[PDB]
Write a protein that binds this DNA or RNA. Structure first.
Ligand SMILES: Nc1nc2[nH]cnc2c(=O)[nH]1
Ligand SMILES: Nc1nc2[nH]cnc2c(=O)[nH]1
Lengths: 338, 338
DNA sequence: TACGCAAACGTTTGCGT
DNA sequence: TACGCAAACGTTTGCGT
């Protein structure tokens, strides 16, 4: 312990503490001795003691949903990098969209007194929004809303709507008029918001999407698989499909292949997320890219701000998706007619 | 603070503390009052203060390598589940195989006084093994060695060698005699160990692998891509390939497709890991499955043990891979001749 | 019966001189 | 000059009675 170090050095703990944090000038001679002891005694200064006094843990908490999913996984790795460099420690929490679970992690977190909170819960019911407020005191930012549901947080917005729009536009411009869509959960932003952006372009083009052509997924490859199936497993099928998430796309690809349908020669498919290895899908996936690192870094930043420069007001920063052309889309029947 | 609660309740903090932890009988009347205050004052008992006294943080640290990679990602989600249920908090650390980085996280961790340490560093150079020892005092288990490199840790072993063997055997038994291999980094267990297990079966079958047929990868889809290419991009090519990791396999698939080679009609491919969505690769990947949840849970368990029942001796538990047949393998030229 | 007083956990940091 | 004494951070837990 520090006392033990001070003794081996025959200096006061104050001195020990000062040399360890260079918070005041100490003589070389003195300072070496301290180091010496620190070394033999093999000292590890306790963060708990420290945090207890200085009042901050240099530790931040990520209340996510799941961390296996490619999408999430990439964001997280991002956030960790940032924590690491500004010297923060990341406490990861998966709540699986479970309220109970969510109230639990929130609670352990406050208790562990994290400096700030990163939230990525996918769906926000009032009960959740409500819980979150009970912690306005701990600084936080939600990284997955589409607009700013609340006033007690910072927020980074992904313009998912404008992504939906881009996707649809692309298909339209490639000659397609018979399109289907497998969207992600409507209770989520990246679900509802992308569908909507997609539907605007359709309506702008006077394209009507037969309900038998829209099939809900859940971002999981299985959902993709079933959706595609149900789509192509029908009398009249579209020539192209907009799928709200790369991993589901992955699944949508498999099924087509399984029905002996050729992509994109038989069906064109466009995804969304540009997950780390969508380029190695077969065929190489054409998708909308979501800035995951920037989404992370930007979030970590507004937090640190609030944390460091004691900011009180809610902030919000937009971020922008962009189209990545790969090999899963092919001209439609109307390309030549424009 | 607790003092503030005790006052609103006109009871001593001792009482407050007792009702909060039911560590001694308190009158209903009394106990309600406490709760009352706890409620208005909106109390969050500090874990730091607590940990400071009781000496444990109910918090565990995962020093990993990377957390985006499918493989790792799944293990982690596993470990978190377990932390959650036994009431521990997970602190995630990616060191990217960086010594400096590794010494840093190790250090922050000790400092943060984590109850135990989960290690998954992929490669273990003496310099790393050395650092690790300096922390024998903090309980730990490495979850990725093939045998027990040290005596100061628990260890879970994956029998990766017997996986390599199974893979090769399969190919042999399907009629293949001309096989190639794209292995993972030899400095890693899941790299070296699987190759070796694979090479034993070959030698048992008197199959010789021409060096021009073995190409190192790094578990990253790109490495897979290049490897396959180099393989098929040659006068004489094998009829089948053993690829040391599903994600590289994913890449190996893409490239074949890109050369207009058909899988498995032109080349047979077998992977390794059985990552969550290898079934949706195209074609559905035939691979060796690695028990990731059990790998996690088992690790979390030996830790808790050491943690709770103050175990001093090094333990080691094996785990077992098993073959999953999917659609990426086809009979070889010698099937009929056996 | 049912509960309090006070010391301790390991630091940091104000004043001293 | 260059450094010490002692109080404080927010708890838990031993003895009391
Ligand atoms: N798995 C997954 N992928 C996504 N991509 C966009 N939103 C999501 C989500 O909630 N889950
Ligand atoms: N990405 C990745 N996959 C693996 N599968 C087995 N070992 C590894 C590894 O070190 N990295």
């Amino acid at each position: 312990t520090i006392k033990d170090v001070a003794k081996r050095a025959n200096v006061s703990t104050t001195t020990v503490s000062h040399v360890i944090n260079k918070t005041r000038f100490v003589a070389e001679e003195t300072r070496n001795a301290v180091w010496a002891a620190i070394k033999e005694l093999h000292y590890s200064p306790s963060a708990v003691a420290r945090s207890l006094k200085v009042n901050h843990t240099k530790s931040i908490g990520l209340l996510a949903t799941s961390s296996e999913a490619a999408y999430f996984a990439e964001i997280i790795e991002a956030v960790e990098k940032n924590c690491f460099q500004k010297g923060y420690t990341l406490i990861l929490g998966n709540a699986w969209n479970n309220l109970e679970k969510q109230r639990a992690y929130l609670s352990m977190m406050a208790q562990k007194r994290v400096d700030g909170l990163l939230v990525m819960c996918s769906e926000y019911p009032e009960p959740l929004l409500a819980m979150l407020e009970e912690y306005r005191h701990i600084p936080m930012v939600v990284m997955d809303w589409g607009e700013a549901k609340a006033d007690f947080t910072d927020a980074v917005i992904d313009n998912a709507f404008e992504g939906g729009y881009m996707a649809g536009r692309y298909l339209i411009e490639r000659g397609h008029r018979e399109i289907g869509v497998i969207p992600g959960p409507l209770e989520a932003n990246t679900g509802a918001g992308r569908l909507a952006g997609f539907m605007k372009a359709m309506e702008e083009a006077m394209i009507k999407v037969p309900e038998s052509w829209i099939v809900q997924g859940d971002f999981e490859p299985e959902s993709g698989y079933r959706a595609m199936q149900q789509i192509l497993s029908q009398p009249h099928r579209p020539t192209a499909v907009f799928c709200g998430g790369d991993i589901m796309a992955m699944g949508a690809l498999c099924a087509a292949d399984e029905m002996g349908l050729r992509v994109p020669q038989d069906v064109s498919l466009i995804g969304y997320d540009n997950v780390r290895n969508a380029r190695y899908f077969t065929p190489a996936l054409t998708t909308i890219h979501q800035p995951k690192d920037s989404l992370g870094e930007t979030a970590f930043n507004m937090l640190l701000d609030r944390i460091v420069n004691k900011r009180e007001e809610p902030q919000s920063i937009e971020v922008h998706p962009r189209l990545i052309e790969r090999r899963s889309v092919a001209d439609g029947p109307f390309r030549d007619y424009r």
